[PDB]
Amino acid sequence: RSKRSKLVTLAQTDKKGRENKERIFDEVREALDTYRYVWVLHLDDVRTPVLQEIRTSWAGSKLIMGKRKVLQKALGEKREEEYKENLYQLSKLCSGVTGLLFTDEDVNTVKEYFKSYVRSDYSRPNTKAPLTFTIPEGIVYSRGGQIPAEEDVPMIHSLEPTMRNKFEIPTKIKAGKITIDSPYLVCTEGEKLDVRQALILKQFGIAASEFKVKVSAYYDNDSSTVESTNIN
Amino acid sequence: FALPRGARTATVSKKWAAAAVCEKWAASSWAKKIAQRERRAALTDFERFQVMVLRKQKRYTVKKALAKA
Amino acid sequence: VEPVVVIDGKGHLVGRLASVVAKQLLNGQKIVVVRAEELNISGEFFRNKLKYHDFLRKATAFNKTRGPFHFRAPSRIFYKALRGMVSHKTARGKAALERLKVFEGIPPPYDKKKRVVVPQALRVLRLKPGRKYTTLGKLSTSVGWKYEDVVAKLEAKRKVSSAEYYAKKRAFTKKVASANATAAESDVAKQLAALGY
Amino acid sequence: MKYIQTEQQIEVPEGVTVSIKSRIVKVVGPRGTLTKNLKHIDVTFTKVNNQLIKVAVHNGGRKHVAALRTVKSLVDNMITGVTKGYKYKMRYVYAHFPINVNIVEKDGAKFIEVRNFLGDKKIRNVPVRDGVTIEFSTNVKDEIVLSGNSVEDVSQNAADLQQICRVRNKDIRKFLDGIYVSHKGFITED
Amino acid sequence: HFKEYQVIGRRLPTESVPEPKLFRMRIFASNEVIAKSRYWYFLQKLHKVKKASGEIVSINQINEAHPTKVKNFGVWVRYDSRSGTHNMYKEIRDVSRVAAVETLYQDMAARHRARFRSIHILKVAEIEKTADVKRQYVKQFLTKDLKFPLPHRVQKSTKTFSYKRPSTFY
Amino acid sequence: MRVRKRQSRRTSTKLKEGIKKKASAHRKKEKKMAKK
RNA sequence: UUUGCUCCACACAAUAUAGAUGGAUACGAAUAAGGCGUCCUUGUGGCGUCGCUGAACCAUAGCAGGCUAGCAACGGUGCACUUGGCGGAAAGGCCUUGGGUGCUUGCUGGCGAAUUGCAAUGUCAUUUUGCGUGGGGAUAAAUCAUUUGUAUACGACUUAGA
RNA sequence: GCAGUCAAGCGUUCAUAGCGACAUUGCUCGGCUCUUCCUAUCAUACCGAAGCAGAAUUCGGUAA
RNA sequence: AAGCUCGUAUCAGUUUUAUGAAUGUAAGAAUGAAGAGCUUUUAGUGGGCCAUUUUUGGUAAGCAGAACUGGCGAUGCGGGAUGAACCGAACGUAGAGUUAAGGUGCCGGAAUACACGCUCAUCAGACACCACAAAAGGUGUUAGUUCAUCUAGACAGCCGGACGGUGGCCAUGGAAGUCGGAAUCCGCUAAGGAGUGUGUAACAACUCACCGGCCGAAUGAACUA
RNA sequence: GAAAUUGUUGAAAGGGAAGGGCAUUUGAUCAGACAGGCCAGCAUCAGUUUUGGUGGCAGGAUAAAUCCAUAGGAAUGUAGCUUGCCUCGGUAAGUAUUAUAGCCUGUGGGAAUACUGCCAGCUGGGACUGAGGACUGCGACGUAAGUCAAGGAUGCUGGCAUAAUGGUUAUAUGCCGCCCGUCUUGAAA
């Protein structure tokens, strides 16, 4: 007794367990013999319609993501446990995030694509943002110090407790509008970010940090070798 | 002392004698105090009278040792 | 063993303390509990206070000058705990109680005198670690007694004088313990050893 | 299930030193010293390597182990209390009547006078604890800063300062007036 | 204090049915007479027999095989309650089977208020390999080089008055 | 505070013996109800 | 009051004892901690040691403790004179300055004990007194009666008067 | 309250030997005066909830 | 009480075996006893209350009728603190030993025994066919049982994704998942509900359920005691 | 010239009852024997009983164990060996069946002891009791005569010889103890 009661809930979606992980196990292994080459992507973070943009970019080649430890034991961890010959040389190289790309295409077409592909995204924690920004010292606006104020709407008064408590910025509301008194800096150019700093830049809708999706290693079926390519 | 776990009697006797915990026991003040009470218990009345006389003599020399410093 | 027996009723347990004093008497042994205030009971404060308080609620309805005399003083507070523990309406009782003496704090000639304890009523031993007890000094105060402070004051000062006495003592002891050690290995000595002493 | 050994690890940084006999704790370091009695708690401290401290409960029920973790928390709070310090920023808001907060020193008590709260002739006197220092925020309107070493001193004084300004027999929704802890933090940010 | 008994019975040899199946079981009791009575009580429940229909053929004290080696026992117990009867598995670290069932009976009375007449000891087994020992309070003592103190010791007084103010060091 | 009245733990002899009669009444009911 | 009353000394009777019969032998605090010894950076400090019972420690040998001969050492102790300091919680006692004075079983000698008949508490304690002694010391109030009226059923109270 | 709807389980196995809680759905001898006590408090004291703008109030908590 | 026989084989609140549809018989079965039968006549006596076990009826619940059985009555004593029916107990006067029921902190005679456990109670509990308020509530605590996850990384914790058809249809001033009425479907994945709550007039924004990233051993749910 | 009831004198007791029973202290008072009595101590005995010490056996798996000899195993893994990264050598992650710790299981051997039961085994301590009164009996030892613990206590020794036993009595103390008679009823009341 005297234990934490788990927050009881009535939502439609349920857990997956080992069933889904075995499906991804079988899908990776059955995609290995079919497709020629395997690219292991170190895509740190991705907006979901960007991945759907990647799926709609080519339907032929298959992209399977998911748990690292599912992909490790599907491809092969060591010398003894391996699907195909010298396949474990790349599983030792994939460290962080999910991404893995089966392909039946040209090598230089793929590496041309991912070097040419870069999209504007939100600035992240532990990465520097290339903007030095201060919020104006009158009424704070929805876009917030990026566009002319006459083309902008003032922020919703309902999210001011989020600004004061969670984002730390000193706010008070006067006649339905959020107001600060002095100009307040949040980030400066070439400087490492905190969690809350990225959340202020997110809330003001500022997407001023580029995202280039990267790959680290590369496989060949017939040559029985693993190639390593450092592009960003 | 160093004893491996679950040691049978012979192993206990091996490490018992090798570490010499019996002599380390007899060296301690605690065994000397136990032996002290046992010595006083089995004292004869005449031997107890010897203690009477010897404590009188020891008292004399000790009282002379004091009242000097 | 002695004519009188002075108990240091500190960190004790009223009950087990009284019960070990009670019979002690009936058997004709003179006894004098001291440092009563510092005495102990058993159970989160409030607990006891609430307890006593209900006792402090019992009075001879029609004439409350006649009913249960409610005593505050830690002494009396612990004389009633020992009283009702002895056929105190008979003669053999009155005669018993009469050789009992409770003192809140330690006055003379008890001060300058050895003072024992009662293991079987020692809170430290009896109680289980981490279990609220309720000192006696508190309960008393928070119910009527009004000399908590004084005693305190008069107690601190009673120790000092005590300390110093000691100091002087530890010294004279050392001196004797050193001389003795120097009397070792002297026929006589040597011998005694063989006869433990 | 009555644990045989339960231990926590109090991590000691470079600047501070921890001296413990029985259950009284020194935290001597850069900003100053802090002391705390813990003889109510019944634990055992162990210094392993002059930079890590091991609290210990042997033969403890769920109630005794629940005490075991709170020692680690309190001693650590003294450590961060000396290394980083504590800084509580209180912002006071008013609708009509300007709240007038000042520091007075009558008989060496260092009181905080809270005047004119909601148009009130009563002059609220808040005692200042030994080890908490009060300054006002420059260039920011209506802000009082509470800073010191102990968490209890700073936070209880912050609680006192906002419980004297109770909106009495009125609305909560309509009357905003009061003093409020806007930010709980440290003196030295890193 | 207990004793283990092998008690056998084979419902008295009559005409047309010679030498029946000799039903053997191990019974924990204090003496031989109680063991015999408990055996008949169990036989009436395991199948439809009676005390008068059979005979005790052999009663034998089963001494413990190695009363010097500390074992890790697992005891399957079932017992009548305030409600219906129910199974229970308690794990006991002890030297002998007699001593382990002893600690069980006192624990069953202490935590479940079941007397001697309620408890049906099903099976006492040695758990040979550790990390198969299920209960955590037993696995608590199976750690490597276990060094634990006994803080706060009581000193048992022989008299009423002491002259020390006792020191509960260890 | 004004400490309110405490319930007794002295069971009077009328209560104690009446407890026994009520108990044996519950038996005679339970033996009859067992048959149905 | 025919020196009545108190206080010191020894003296005889009595009267009792909820119960002497070697010694009530003084740190404080903590208990998941302490005591003592030593040392130093003087500290909630290092190093050593102790407890696990007062089963201790101090006192303890002499006709219920006599009489004497010594030897060794400047000790131990009793008694009464005595310099102070200390003690207010019921202090009523604690240490100390010295002179005298017996005794000492520290060690060694010489006398005396018995017949209390094989045991009979075998009386050695401490109160409360009274009668005697031989020395000090100290020189009353209260009640009734009268009055008073701040009091008053009567008592009681407050007063007043050589 | 009666009847039904669910229905944790138990029924000698067990839902088709049966009992079955909270809900829910069906229409419908009296009085004068004093002392003491109880709280199950009308007021006075302090609080919590309430479209509680203020005032006024409603419910609730501690409280004899 | 008196007389006359046999002092016996005259029997018994009992068991066994057999005969039978808890009661019926017989025994050259057992065990127990020396107090048996027959006349004659002479006092007192002619209520019941309590409880246990069978059994038939009953009901919110108590219960009501028989039979048989104890107890009290004509009976002291030990115990249950106290006492009409509760536990013990073959009453001359004494001595010694041992016990019954009940007990062993002190009152109070006898262990502040020993051993394993459980309990902290804002008036605990010592109580008793474990009977009444009693079915439950509780983030008190200790044991269990049955299903679950888990080094293909368990629970907790932050960090991120949490998608496009799609602002699905009616609704209506304005309802984009989140005032409401009905299905509640497809695709894309590692996974994302015609949407779990906060929110705006409407959107937005946040949240979780679902995944994924570091973190590295246990944890989760439903019941029983 | 009784008792009720009262006075005086002497003793004693008395904190919201008294008188009563068992036992004793205390105070008061009294009886004999002394023309062998009162109280005791020790020894050896007998009956009932309580409490220790020590020896011999016998039973079970002819204890089980331990211990020893042999054959296999895994470990909370032992020495060694390999490896990682550091405060110099500690730790950690593999091997390694014990090598420079040990443990478990199996087979065999020769023992001890616990527990249980018996001895018409021995040897102590303590308590209460001594009834009967020439001899018969049953016995034991003794070569026999005789002796004895065998059909119930004798032997030795001491104090006192009266208030020292004990009694009566007033009180104290521990424990117990409804107010009798009647009449009711199943009882109490």
UniProtKB/Swiss-Prot annotation, chain A:
Keywords: Cytoplasm, Nucleus, Ribosome biogenesis. One of its GO terms (biological process) is ribosomal large subunit export from nucleus. Its main location: nucleus. It comes from the Eukaryota. One of its GO terms (cellular component) is nucleoplasm. The gene is MRT4. It is found in: Nucleus, Nucleolus; Cytoplasm. The keyword Transcription does not apply. It holds the Pfam family RL10P_insert. Present with 18200 molecules/cell in log phase SD medium. Component of the ribosome assembly machinery. Nuclear paralog of the ribosomal protein P0, it binds pre-60S subunits at an early stage of assembly in the nucleolus, and is replaced by P0 in cytoplasmic pre-60S subunits and mature 80S ribosomes. CDD domains: Ribosomal_P0_like (cd05796). InterPro entries: Mrt4, Ribosomal_uL10, Ribosomal_uL10-like_insert, Ribosomal_uL10-like_insert_sf, Ribosomal_uL10-like_sf, Ribosome_Assembly_uL10. This is Ribosome assembly factor MRT4. Signal peptide: none annotated. Associates with the pre-60S ribosomal particle. Belongs to the universal ribosomal protein uL10 family.
Curated annotation (Swiss-Prot), chain B:
GO terms for molecular function: RNA binding; structural constituent of ribosome. It is found in: Cytoplasm. Keywords: Acetylation, Cytoplasm, Ribonucleoprotein, Ribosomal protein. N-terminally acetylated by acetyltransferase NatA. One of its GO terms (biological process) is maturation of LSU-rRNA. GO terms for cellular component: cytosol; cytosolic large ribosomal subunit; nucleolus. Belongs to the eukaryotic ribosomal protein eL14 family. Component of the ribosome, a large ribonucleoprotein complex responsible for the synthesis of proteins in the cell. The small ribosomal subunit (SSU) binds messenger RNAs (mRNAs) and translates the encoded message by selecting cognate aminoacyl-transfer RNA (tRNA) molecules. The large subunit (LSU) contains the ribosomal catalytic site termed the peptidyl transferase center (PTC), which catalyzes the formation of peptide bonds, thereby polymerizing the amino acids delivered by tRNAs into a polypeptide chain. This is Large ribosomal subunit protein eL14A. The chain holds residues 70 to 138 of 138 of the full protein.
Curated annotation (Swiss-Prot), chain D:
Component of the large ribosomal subunit (LSU). Mature yeast ribosomes consist of a small (40S) and a large (60S) subunit. The 40S small subunit contains 1 molecule of ribosomal RNA (18S rRNA) and 33 different proteins (encoded by 57 genes). The large 60S subunit contains 3 rRNA molecules (25S, 5.8S and 5S rRNA) and 46 different proteins (encoded by 81 genes). uL6 lines the binding pocket for eukaryotic elongation factor 2 (eEF2). GO terms for cellular component: cytosol; cytosolic large ribosomal subunit. InterPro entries: Ribosomal_uL6-like, Ribosomal_uL6-like_a/b-dom_sf, Ribosomal_uL6_a/b-dom, Ribosomal_uL6_CS2. Coiled coil: none annotated. This is Large ribosomal subunit protein uL6A. Present with 52400 molecules/cell in log phase SD medium. There are 2 genes for uL6 in yeast. GO terms for molecular function: rRNA binding; structural constituent of ribosome. The gene is RPL9A. It is found in: Cytoplasm. It comes from Saccharomyces cerevisiae (strain ATCC 204508 / S288c). Belongs to the universal ribosomal protein uL6 family.
Swiss-Prot record, chain F:
Residues 1-13, 21-34 have a biased composition (Basic residues). It is found in: Nucleus. GTPase required for 60S ribosomal subunit export to the cytoplasm. In contrast to other GTP-binding proteins, this family is characterized by a circular permutation of the GTPase motifs described by a G4-G1-G3 pattern. Present with 7130 molecules/cell in log phase SD medium. Belongs to the TRAFAC class YlqF/YawG GTPase family. This is Nuclear GTP-binding protein NUG1. The lineage of its organism: Eukaryota, Fungi, Dikarya, Ascomycota, Saccharomycotina.
